[PDB]
Write a protein that holds these residues in place. Structure first.
Motif, PDB file in Angstrom:
ATOM      1  N   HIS A  79       0.813  -1.213   0.000  1.00  0.00           N
ATOM      2  CA  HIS A  79       0.000   0.000   0.000  1.00  0.00           C
ATOM      3  C   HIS A  79       0.851   1.270   0.000  1.00  0.00           C
ATOM      4  N   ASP A  80       2.031   1.195   0.608  1.00  0.00           N
ATOM      5  CA  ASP A  80       2.961   2.320   0.605  1.00  0.00           C
ATOM      6  C   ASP A  80       4.195   2.008  -0.238  1.00  0.00           C
ATOM      7  N   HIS A 132       6.309   4.922  -2.180  1.00  0.00           N
ATOM      8  CA  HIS A 132       7.200   5.776  -1.404  1.00  0.00           C
ATOM      9  C   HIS A 132       8.665   5.580  -1.783  1.00  0.00           C
ATOM     10  N   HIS A 192       1.592   8.539  -3.498  1.00  0.00           N
ATOM     11  CA  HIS A 192       2.213   7.236  -3.274  1.00  0.00           C
ATOM     12  C   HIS A 192       1.187   6.112  -3.388  1.00  0.00           C
ATOM     13  N   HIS A 227      -6.196   3.856  -0.311  1.00  0.00           N
ATOM     14  CA  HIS A 227      -5.796   3.803   1.091  1.00  0.00           C
ATOM     15  C   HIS A 227      -5.642   5.206   1.672  1.00  0.00           C
ATOM     16  N   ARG A 261      -6.991   0.408   5.639  1.00  0.00           N
ATOM     17  CA  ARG A 261      -6.478   1.574   6.351  1.00  0.00           C
ATOM     18  C   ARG A 261      -6.368   1.300   7.848  1.00  0.00           C
ATOM     19  N   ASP A 275      -3.227  -0.298   8.344  1.00  0.00           N
ATOM     20  CA  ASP A 275      -2.104   0.607   8.130  1.00  0.00           C
ATOM     21  C   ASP A 275      -1.849   1.457   9.370  1.00  0.00           C
TER      22      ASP A 275
END
Ligand SMILES: [Fe+3]
Ligand SMILES: [Fe+3]
Length: 180
Positions: free
Chosen positions: A55-56, A59, A72, A96, A150, A153
């Motif tokens: 999900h990230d 980055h 991102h 997200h 989320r 996260d």
């Protein structure tokens, strides 16, 4: 091939451990792994686990505080589309950020749940949604799944937590690329 595509992903992941934490409490690899850990722990399918794992991703595959990379969620989604990932995994990852903006504007006490890094990035991601912007987000067929990701996260920020390495999700990523 498919064994090499995942070999790039695991390479991209392991290298995030050497990065700048983007203002979080754990390195960008543990954040990725804990999410997939919480996703798999809930009994979710493979598509939800991989989405939380990457999900990230936007980055560190190519301006926000600095607490991250611009879009991102979009950059991370587009990168996986090139590998052959499903649109579901792409939208879940791309949504997200919008998931947080929804939860903050909805829950009047969700801002405290946010990390320092995630809160600062909110001032770059659009802040609290307007009355009409959250209307469209609820129209999504994956409106439920986006909120669950989320939550993983925000939960995946544990410092004293043992989580399986990226190699544990190698077979899951290979089988996913074969279905598409
Ligand atoms: Fe994020
Ligand atoms: Fe995250």
């Amino acid at each position: 091939s498919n064994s090499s595509k995942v070999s790039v992903l695991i390479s991209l992941l392991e290298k995030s451990r050497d990065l700048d934490y983007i203002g979080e409490a754990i390195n960008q690899l543990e954040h990725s792994l804990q999410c997939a850990y919480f996703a798999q722990r809930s009994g979710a399918d493979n598509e939800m686990v991989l989405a939380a794992l990457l999900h990230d991703l936007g980055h560190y595959c190519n301006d926000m505080g600095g607490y991250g990379v611009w879009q991102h969620e979009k950059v991370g989604a587009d990168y996986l589309r090139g590998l052959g990932f499903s649109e579901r995994v792409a939208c879940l990852i791309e949504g997200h950020v919008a998931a947080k903006r929804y939860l903050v504007s909805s829950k009047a006490s969700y801002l405290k749940n946010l990390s320092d890094a995630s809160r600062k990035t909110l001032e770059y991601q659009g802040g609290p949604m307007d009355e009409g912007e959250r209307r469209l987000f609820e129209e999504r067929e994956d409106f439920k799944d986006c909120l669950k990701i989320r939550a993983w996260d925000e939960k995946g920020k544990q410092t004293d937590l043992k989580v399986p390495g990226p190699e544990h999700y190698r077979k899951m990523m290979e089988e996913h690329l074969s279905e598409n």
